RNA sequence: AUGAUGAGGUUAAUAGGUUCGAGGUGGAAGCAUGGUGACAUGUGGAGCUGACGAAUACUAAUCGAUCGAAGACUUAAU
RNA sequence: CGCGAGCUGGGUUCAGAACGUCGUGAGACAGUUCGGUCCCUAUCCGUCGUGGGCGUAGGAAAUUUGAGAGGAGCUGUCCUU
RNA sequence: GACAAUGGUAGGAGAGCGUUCUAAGGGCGUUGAAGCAUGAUCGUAAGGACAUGUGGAGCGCUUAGAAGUGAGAAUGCCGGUGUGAGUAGCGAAAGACGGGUGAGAAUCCCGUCCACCGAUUGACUAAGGUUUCCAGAGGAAGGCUCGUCCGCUCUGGGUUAGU
RNA sequence: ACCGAUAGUGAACCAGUACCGUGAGGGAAAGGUGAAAAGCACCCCGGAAGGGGAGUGAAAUAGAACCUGAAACCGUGUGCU
RNA sequence: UUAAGUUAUUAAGGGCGCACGGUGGAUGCCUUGGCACUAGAAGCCGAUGAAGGACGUUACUAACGACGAUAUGCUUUGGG
């Protein structure tokens, strides 16, 4: 059985969040918490909050053993962007993309 | 000054193969708490 | 020596205000490079305190800022009087050291290595 | 550097604005043309 | 530049501190004497000294963790 | 008439002005004279350094062979004969 | 059944395929229409089917009409979306520490120290701006970072003249 | 044998309106839950957003950006390389 | 064993194929709104203060309609 959580429209950009999200996938659920507490990226308190949420949906909703779970899927999709402008020089604006992310981690124990 | 050609999806992904990030220290605190960063004293949720 | 990202006078003023506050509170939280450099400042300033003569009283006041400690029972000593009176009596047998640096995690706004420098 | 349009509440109301448009026939033409577009603010 | 390179990581002199130097500056403060004074002289090559040298475990190089071989066939001599 | 996305801009085809000359004139000369804004965050190739990966039929540490490639390579004067 | 022809641009001629609508006829659809997606199907071509998903109401076929009828290009127009690239930048400048606040503090508050302006970065007062002013409350967006703060947002207040 | 939302009035939407201009003047973009709001009571994580259940409904990848959701683009897996 | 010879295994990453997502709003269907007309009226008001507006008026009120201090309406005659 699998347990998932998502975080939709997180204001961290998708390229910046997929760095730290590559560090934790495939790894067991206990040590993935320890990686997300020690990397000093901006995304590390956000994926950790989502990994807490999917380990909680495992214990509560599906009654899994949260001690032995492994992070199967850990991906971040693109969300809707906020298109901002920026005045540079000589009356000439340039677009700034405030990108958002849908962060999704799923967790399981590998059994059916 | 400007790129004469666009970079492809293949050439872009070959460039950023070293655009990675490392796993940190991750040593246990033997007194109490969770994993601390190596050679560091803990502040929260640990006794180092 | 380290330049700490500042001018010759901005570094000098930063480094003796950081050495005074490590006499007031005896353990302060700074960054790692600013604690590597105030380490040699305050240890050379406890060396002047273990002497205790008038000639090195004048030299410890080259460095120390004019800060007044509110001690217990509402008594007030300066940081110059607290250097030759309390720290100088603690380390009168020890031949060095006088500080330690305990590393901590990065800050939130930076990847600045936080550090507690203590007075041992 | 000093730009154009240094504002003035008296001159703006006196070279534009209603009692000036109404004083000449060609300024009642600009009022009739803005009533015909449905323009919310005249003058 | 980064990282690489090199010296070390407690059985440790790696860096700092401390102690002693080297070199540098040129006679500290305080005190005494003399001068009405400004100042001189003595105390005294004095004090001070960032990177240099030596000594010293005083402080910090913690506990840890990761990676890493099992030796393919074929034929020929042996 | 190598080299300005390496540099200057004295020379010159810019707007000002003046002389000579020509034109009735506005102007003109390819005659002078004074003055006159030099944009670019390097994608690819190429170059100068520097790492990582893998291979080199076990894995390592250390010393090396040199297939090759590159650098160097100038010359005066004086004295003896 | 013989025989012959069949490179081709401007350009001429011919025969077609699809598209939307109309007319008549004949139909198909919640036992799932059109679309959409996939497939190893058929036709000489433009094209046509079928199957299975998705989809949740329409649409085929035959004949004949009508045309806003077929796009890859116009430094086309309008939308999205990349590339450059995690690159340039982050708009003159000195802060440091302690305490506090909180989900969270290099930035918020308080304190001390330091620094800067000081014929002014100090006070008034016009123009001009309109409510930004003041209290609590908040942290989505705005602030070139952060944010517990704000000229931001929410709620409630605030301007008194015989001279 | 008129248009179906880049069409048809600029405007199917609190349009000559945001907005632009000192002014005349110029001038947008933006329709679709379901039959019915029955618009998710409660539980869990979280500061909150968000989620995971449960529940409504024929359907909830119909959850208010809400009919279908095509490509560009971004991903995560893989079979062969 | 020693030679000599041959051929792999590697995928940091990449390619193709497949699968599953996300973004995005094409397409299908839909229509409040437009478009072109036909027929029948009518066309232009105002110093008795027009067209246009501005401020107001609902228990709570921003806007738009509606109506002005008798203000989110009043009276009356008829429908209902
Ligand atoms: Mg990559
Ligand atoms: Mg100075
Ligand atoms: Mg060139
Ligand atoms: Mg001229
Ligand atoms: Mg003449
Ligand atoms: Mg000049
Ligand atoms: Mg032919
Ligand atoms: Mg023809
Ligand atoms: Mg049904
Ligand atoms: Mg179906
Ligand atoms: Mg159709
Ligand atoms: Mg279908
Ligand atoms: Mg056409
Ligand atoms: Mg085009
Ligand atoms: Mg970088
Ligand atoms: Mg950066
Ligand atoms: Mg670049
Ligand atoms: Mg750079
Ligand atoms: Mg930079
Ligand atoms: Mg700034
Ligand atoms: Mg205020
Ligand atoms: Mg306030
Ligand atoms: Mg921010
Ligand atoms: Mg506040
Ligand atoms: Mg549509
Ligand atoms: Mg339209
Ligand atoms: Mg919620
Ligand atoms: Mg669907
Ligand atoms: Mg429907
Ligand atoms: Mg949809
Ligand atoms: Mg890989
Ligand atoms: Mg009359």
Automatic annotation (TrEMBL), chain A:
Signal sequence bounds: none
Described function: The globular domain of the protein is located near the polypeptide exit tunnel on the outside of the subunit, while an extended beta-hairpin is found that lines the wall of the exit tunnel in the center of the 70S ribosome.
InterPro entries in the cross-refs: Ribosomal_uL22, Ribosomal_uL22_bac/chlpt-type, Ribosomal_uL22_bac/org-type, Ribosomal_uL22_CS, Ribosomal_uL22_sf
Gene3D superfamilies the UniProt entry points to: Ribosomal protein L22/L17 (3.90.470.10)
Any Gene Ontology CC annotation: cytosolic large ribosomal subunit
Family: Belongs to the universal ribosomal protein uL22 family.
Gene name for this UniProt entry: rplV
GO molecular function: rRNA binding; structural constituent of ribosome
Keywords: Ribonucleoprotein, Ribosomal protein, RNA-binding, rRNA-binding
GO biological process annotation, one example: translation
Subunit structure: Part of the 50S ribosomal subunit.
Name recorded for this polypeptide: Large ribosomal subunit protein uL22
Organism: Staphylococcus schweitzeri
Domain of life of the native organism: Bacteria
Pfam families attached to this UniProt entry: Ribosomal_L22
From TrEMBL, chain B:
Keyword ATP-binding: no
Keyword Transmembrane part of the UniProt annotation: no
Alphabetical UniProt keywords: Ribonucleoprotein, Ribosomal protein
Any one Gene Ontology BP term: translation
GO MF assignments: structural constituent of ribosome
The organism's place on the tree of life at top rank: Bacteria
CC per GO annotation: large ribosomal subunit
Family: Belongs to the bacterial ribosomal protein bL32 family.
Protein name: Large ribosomal subunit protein bL32
UniProt source species: Staphylococcus schweitzeri
Lineage: Bacteria, Bacillati, Bacillota, Bacilli, Bacillales
First-to-last residue of the parent protein present: 2 to 49 of 57
From TrEMBL, chain C:
Assembly mode: Part of the 50S ribosomal subunit. Contacts protein L32.
Entries under InterPro entries matching the protein: Ribosomal_bL17, Ribosomal_bL17_CS, Ribosomal_bL17_sf
Gene Ontology biological process terms from the UniProt entry: translation
HAMAP family in the record: Ribosomal_bL17
Keywords: Ribonucleoprotein, Ribosomal protein
A Pfam family this chain is assigned to: Ribosomal_L17
Recorded family membership: Belongs to the bacterial ribosomal protein bL17 family.
Gene3D superfamilies assigned to the protein according to its UniProt record, in alphabetical order: Ribosomal protein L17 (3.90.1030.10)
SUPFAM superfamilies per record: Prokaryotic ribosomal protein L17
Organism: Staphylococcus schweitzeri
Entry keyword Glycoprotein: no
Protein known as: Large ribosomal subunit protein bL17
A GO molecular-function descriptor: structural constituent of ribosome
